[PDB]
Amino acid sequence: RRRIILFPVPFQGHINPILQLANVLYSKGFSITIFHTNFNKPKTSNYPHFTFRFILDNDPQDERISNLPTHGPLAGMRIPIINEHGADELRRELELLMLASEEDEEVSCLITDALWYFAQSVADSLNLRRLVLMTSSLFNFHAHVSLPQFDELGYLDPRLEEQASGFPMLKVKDIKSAYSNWQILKEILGKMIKQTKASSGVIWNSFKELEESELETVIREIPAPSFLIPLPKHLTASSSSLLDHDRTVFQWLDQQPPSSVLYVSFGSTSEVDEKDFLEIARGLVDSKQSFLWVVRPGFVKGSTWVEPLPDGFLGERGRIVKWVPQQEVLAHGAIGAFWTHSGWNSTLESVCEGVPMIFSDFGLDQPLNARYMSDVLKVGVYLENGWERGEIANAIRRVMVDEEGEYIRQNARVLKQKADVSLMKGGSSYESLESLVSYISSL
Numbered sequence: 392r393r394r395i396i397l398f399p400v401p402f403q404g405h406i407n408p409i410l411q412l413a414n415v416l417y418s419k420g421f422s423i424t425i426f427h428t429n430f431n432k433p434k435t436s437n438y439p440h441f442t443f444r445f446i447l448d449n450d451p452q453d454e455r456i457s458n459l460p461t462h463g464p465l466a467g468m469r470i471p472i473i474n475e476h477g478a479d480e481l482r483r484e485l486e487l488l489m490l491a492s493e494e495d496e497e498v499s500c501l502i503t504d505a506l507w508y509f510a511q512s513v514a515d516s517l518n519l520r521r522l523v524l525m526t527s528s529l530f531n532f533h534a535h536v537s538l539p540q541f542d543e544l545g546y547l548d549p550r551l552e553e554q555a556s557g558f559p560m561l562k563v564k565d566i567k568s569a570y571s572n573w574q575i576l577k578e579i580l581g582k583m584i585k586q587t588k589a590s591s592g593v594i595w596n597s598f599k600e601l602e603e604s605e606l607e608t609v610i611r612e613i614p615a616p617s618f619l620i621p622l623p624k625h626l627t628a629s630s631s632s633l634l635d636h637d638r639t640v641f642q643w644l645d646q647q648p649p650s651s652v653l654y655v656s657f658g659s660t661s662e663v664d665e666k667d668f669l670e671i672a673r674g675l676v677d678s679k680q681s682f683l684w685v686v687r688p689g690f691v692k693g694s695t696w697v698e699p700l701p702d703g704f705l706g707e708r709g710r711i712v713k714w715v716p717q718q719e720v721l722a723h724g725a726i727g728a729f730w731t732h733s734g735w736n737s738t739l740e741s742v743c744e745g746v747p748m749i750f751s752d753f754g755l756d757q758p759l760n761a762r763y764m765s766d767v768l769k770v771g772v773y774l775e776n777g778w779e780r781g782e783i784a785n786a787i788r789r790v791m792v793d794e795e796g797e798y799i800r801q802n803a804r805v806l807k808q809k810a811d812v813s814l815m816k817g818g819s820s821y822e823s824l825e826s827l828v829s830y831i832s833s834l
């Protein structure tokens with residue numbers, strides 16, 4: 392019997408793929424331990440088949456992380472802090488577990504979020520192999536390793552509509568938005584890349600037919616073996632939700648005609664002005680399409696939830712809720728399109744359920760996902776110039792109703808089929824997973 396320890400980053404878009412992976416590996420016969428912070432912990436009672444061990448922010452909490460905000464853009468400060476100071480505790484916890492191991496039980500490897508770059512030297516020091524889970528795309532990684540070239544050209548220092556030097560796929564505007572903050576994130580980025588290259592293997596939440604153009608860069612830049620597995624095609628992330636689901640939406644979805652509903656959601660951490668929030672609502676109403684709009688409490692700066700919205704303003708066609716089982720909604724027959732912030736989990740979920748998209752973005756990898764999805768794969772329309780009700784209504788109707796958008800709807804259907812075929816024997820994802828299991832078993 393072989394045990395795998397997995398160590399996620401404690402945010403929704405990082406906990407979801409690592410617990411999907413944990414379940415996949417469990418299905419292949421591995422026992423599973425999850426190392427996790429108390430902060431943003433998932434519901435351990437949803438995982439009776441996993442062992443959870445809480446680390447790094449136990450009582451008494453550190454002056455470095457104590458009273459750090461549990462929500463907002465500053466909650467992420469925990470990441471660099473744990474990278475800089477958690478090595479000794481992580482080693483102690485790994486040793487404790489390796490000591491408590493049953494005689495017939497071996498710890499095969501540690502799998503961490505790529506953001507936990509500090510974990511490589513910890514694993515090395517224990518003669519424990521470390522594999523890395525990337526929670527972003529191969530295309531985004533290709534952009535990462537092109538930063539030096541981008542910097543030479545001055546893209547990173549603030550011709551926007553112009554094609555980038557080595558990315559005809561990208562506009563200079565995309566790169567500026569993606570690396571808008573860079574003196575701040577440059578240091579994290581370099582260390583993550585360096586310790587990913589130094590790892591024993593890299594697992595990508597993707598599939599070959601999704602990012603074929605990006606495979607050679609990964610093979611050339613990362614000496615460790617890479618494995619591409621589209622985790623949403625194996626299972627949804629419902630069990631790792633950090634918020635309660637509103638499942639009353641499914642009775643409502645059951646009252647809608649096929650492909651008639653726009654699903655709208657901007658992920659787990661995004662926030663918008665009161666002004667932009669109201670413009671989005673007017674664009675949705677103006678589209679005349681039915682819509683289901685997830686507005687996470689905290690999404691609107693200065694309001695607990697959705698106070699600025701007039702009572703009944705959404706009217707007949709629209710519903711607003713706080714949180715749903717997103718991939719399950721995307722799989723419902725009523726959904727015709729997905730207005731996304733282009734987070735990678737949401738984008739891959741939509742691809743895997745065959746739902747075409749309208750893209751907004753909040754920086755980081757999101758503009759790159761939106762550009763790649765909209766111009767390379769051609770499964771959506773990118774609202775790349777802010778929020779204006781007219782352009783919003785036109786984009787929604789183009790994807791969902793216009794005859795001119797049929798090719799986008801068809802591309803989304805075909806791309807889902809490619810994902811499905813990739814999981815069949817002889818498919819790319821099937822062979823990646825087979826290779827991953829045999830590789831881990833050889834450690």
Ligand SMILES: O=c1ccn([C@@H]2O[C@H](COP(=O)(O)OP(=O)(O)O)[C@@H](O)[C@H]2O)c(=O)[nH]1
Nearest residue numbers: 404658659660685714715717734735736737
């Ligand atoms: O109402 C919601 C909204 C989002 N999600 C999930 O939250 C994750 C968001 O991750 P993503 O990479 O899309 O964006 P992030 O939150 O990291 O910005 C995805 O797995 C979604 O399915 C969900 O379960 N219910």
